[PDB]
């Protein structure tokens with residue numbers, strides 16, 4: 001069937017000119033609302049959640065791992081590295097790299113997480129270990145953001161990412177202290193106020209990870225603690241037909257508003 005919420009999301013998508021993917025999980029009753037929920041979208045920086053979580057999982061058996069220094073060299077800098085560039089010729093710990101990757105979306109930091117996991121396939125392997133058969137990471141930063149229509153590299157579906165985000169942040173894919181650390185990082189994101197949370201009541205608490213790339217790709221994945229109800233998990237992915245298209249964070253906000261109005 002097609003619900004009123006799904007029809008509104010389709011109208012939003014039609015006005016936007018692009019392709020919108022939405023997946024909500026309401027943990028009050030485990031119900032789901034999906035729009036293009038099984039179509040693939042380029043993850044861009046939203047893939048950093050899986051990489052940081054995979055390192056958190058490694059840290060469960062290595063109490064000192066997150067304090068291990070990682071050397072940052074001039075050649076490690078890529079296209080967006082506001083934190084890592086302050087540490088060139090120095091070191092950052094895996095905790096610092098995770099925080100920078102998640103909260104500032106530093107791309108050099110993401111590459112250090114990927115390298116710690118043995119390459120993009122190590123991120124995919126972690127996804128499989130936690131029951132996500134859909135996620136794939138194939139490249140490092142910055143090429144993982146090419147976002148070419150029809151290209152399966154570095155993609156997932158809204159349904160799969162919402163399920164994984166739930167398991168990581170509210171479920172038991174990670175140990176208790178690691179889950180809390182991931183939640184703390186997401187709640188401290190600096191980049192999210194124009195995306196999902198712009199469409200939600202201001203009294204609700206949000207932790208999220210945004211992303212963007214070529215083809216005007218504009219993404220956000222969020223855990224939401226609304227006023228007076230159990231948490232929600234919401235993924236909004238958006239991509240456009242031309243390579244140089246502008247970001248449309250407003251579309252993600254609009255999708256979130258439609259979702260919230262349908263609760």
Ligand SMILES: *C(=O)N1C[C@H](NOS(=O)(=O)O)CC[C@H]1C(N)=O
Pocket residue numbers: 043044045046080104105106107141142145191210211212213
């Ligand atoms: C992630 O998608 N990226 C990293 C950086 N920050 O944007 S974010 O805050 O939306 O994550 C620049 C854009 C993008 C990229 N091209 O790597």
Ligand SMILES: [K+]
Pocket residue numbers: 210211212247
């Ligand atoms: K961006």
Ligand SMILES: [K+]
Pocket residue numbers: 026031262263
């Ligand atoms: K609901």
Ligand code: NA
Pocket residue numbers: 212213214215216217245246247
């Ligand atoms: Na772009």
